[PDB]
């Protein structure tokens, strides 16, 4: 068997129920081989708080040796394994979902086997292992993982792009969760630098992929889902940080035919407004946030309101002079992108035509984010 | 119709391409060695980027207005593709919701067990510290 059997103060064979672990949690007998611990919840509870050095060394050695020996495409051409490797990786991933941290053996294996990876053998397990990476400086970890990941990212299909975006979102969530508890105990500014660099890196990746894939909405949904998690850093984790996504993504999402994309964009804009107005009042108390972010957000909001119902679509981004429309033959352009004449709302307009103050109908259709944005903007 | 305009534009661009190729065909070849390869390539990259920036700055959005039927057909095709995109998005969202519910249940159970074990350990600590 890949996992060593359970073999032998308090005797180990008598430990069979949760109350027994509760009574003798302080004194326990460690197994001869730590591999048998990998599939035992009761021993996992004890190891959850041990932080003992020889224990960690033994576990690291055993896990690294097992992973190196059981690989399919590294150091050996052995495809006979198949499902055994997948089951072992699933067990490891389930174990590290507990303990709220990852082992160094997995990080070493990822550093070792990533360049030779093809991107199709064990995509799910590898992309789940990537999320459990210990926090470190972005500059040190970039050449080891992110270079190869970006090289593999630009030459694969759209599904690979969506999968890596999901993995990056999970990694960002884990990093934020771990950094949140630190302040309750490199300084803060030296650590926010890494997350800012990561956000800029993923934004650049998203922009390039959006350009490559000929404006596909399927990837746009994943990008917007990632930025939904990005938007609430200051509120959810009480960390001072506000980062805005590039104008390319904003102007690709605003001028899309999908209604759900518009709803998600309105929700994200409302979340930015709430976070900014919550942080501005606390800035006076803590006294630094750059104002340039404030002007960029103001420009975005101005463009949004001008395109929605203000009949002023020609903002800072859409700097289109009227002579092009005049020579083309466009007479009514002020209220052409409005709620009534927007291409995304064409279906709703046709549906309401068969049956004037139809905003309630749109809200009843499920446009919750637009309603929230309208309530937050008018008031 | 606009088809004649498109054909004329393609022909003019092909003629310009031919003239450009004829002008470019008068430059000699330059081969590299293992000792002076990196620096020469870097210099050539710098020159090419400088040329491309100026080329991109001069470009302007072309109007070339078309008819209305072609726009209608393009919109029809866009809606047709958007249908399948929406159905795939819906299926992925359903799978995500199912996984989220399962993970929520598992995390709740783990939290309960952790609370129990923490309480037991704290009671044992109090008992040992009392004696």
């Amino acid at each position: 068997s890949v996992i060593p059997v359970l073999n032998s103060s308090f005797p180990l064979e008598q430990l069979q129920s949760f109350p027994q672990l509760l009574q003798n949690i302080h004194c326990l007998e460690l197994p001869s081989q730590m591999g048998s611990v990998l599939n035992n919840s009761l021993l996992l509870h004890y190891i959850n708080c041990v932080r003992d050095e020889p224990v960690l060394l033994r576990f690291y050695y055993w896990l690294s040796q097992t992973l190196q020996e059981e690989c399919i495409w590294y150091k050996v051409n052995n495809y006979e394994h198949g499902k055994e490797f997948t089951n072992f990786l699933d067990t490891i991933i389930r174990a590290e979902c507990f303990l709220q941290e990852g082992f160094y053996s997995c990080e070493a294996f990822l550093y070792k086997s990533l360049p030779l990876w093809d991107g199709l053998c064990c995509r799910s397990q590898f992309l789940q292992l990537v999320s459990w990476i210990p926090f470190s400086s972005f500059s040190e970890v970039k050449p080891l993982l992110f270079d190869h990941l970006a090289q593999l990212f630009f030459t694969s299909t759209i599904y690979f792009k969506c999968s890596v975006l999901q993995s990056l979102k999970e990694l960002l969530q884990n990093w934020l969760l771990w950094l949140s508890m630190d302040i309750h105990m490199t300084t803060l500014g030296g650590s926010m630098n890494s997350v800012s660099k990561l956000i800029h890196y993923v934004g650049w990746l998203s922009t390039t992929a959006m350009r490559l894939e000929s404006n596909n909405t399927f990837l746009l949904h994943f990008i917007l889902d990632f930025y939904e998690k990005v938007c609430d850093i200051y509120i959810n984790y009480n960390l001072p940080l506000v980062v805005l996504f590039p104008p390319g993504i904003f102007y690709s999402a605003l001028l899309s035919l999908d209604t759900s994309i518009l709803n998600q964009l309105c929700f994200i804009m409302h979340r930015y407004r709430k976070n900014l107005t919550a942080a501005k009042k606390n800035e006076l108390v803590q006294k630094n946030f750059s104002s340039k972010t404030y002007q960029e957000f103001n420009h975005y909001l101005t463009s949004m309101v001008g395109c929605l119902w203000t009949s002023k679509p020609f903002g800072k981004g859409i700097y289109i002079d009227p002579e092009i429309l005049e020579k083309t033959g466009v007479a009514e352009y002020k209220n052409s992108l409005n709620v009534v004449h927007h291409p995304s709302f064409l279906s709703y307009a046709v549906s309401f035509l068969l049956q004037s103050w139809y905003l309630d109908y749109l809200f009843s259709q499920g446009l919750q984010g637009l309603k929230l944005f309208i309530r937050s903007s008018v008031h | 119709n606009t088809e004649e305009e498109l054909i004329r534009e393609c022909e003019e661009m092909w003629k310009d391409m031919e003239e450009c190729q004829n002008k470019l065909s008068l430059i000699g070849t330059e081969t590299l060695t293992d000792s002076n390869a990196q620096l020469s390539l870097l210099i050539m990259q710098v020159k090419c980027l400088t040329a491309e920036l100026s080329q991109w700055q001069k470009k302007t959005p072309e109007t070339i207005p078309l008819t209305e039927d072609v726009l209608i057909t393009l919109g029809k095709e866009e809606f047709q593709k958007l249908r399948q995109d929406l159905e795939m998005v819906l299926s992925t969202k359903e799978s995500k919701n199912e996984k989220l519910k399962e993970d929520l249940e598992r995390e709740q159970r783990w939290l309960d067990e952790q609370q129990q074990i923490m309480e037991s350990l704290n009671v044992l600590h109090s008992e040992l510290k009392n004696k």
């Binding site: 995509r123 799910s124 599904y159 999968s163 | 795939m88 992925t92 799978s95 995500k96 996984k99």
Partner: peptide
């Protein structure tokens, strides 16, 4: 899982 659904969609 989400990835299992993505894989089973990719095969077909």
């Amino acid at each position: 899982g989400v990835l299992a659904h993505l894989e089973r969609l990719e095969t077909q």
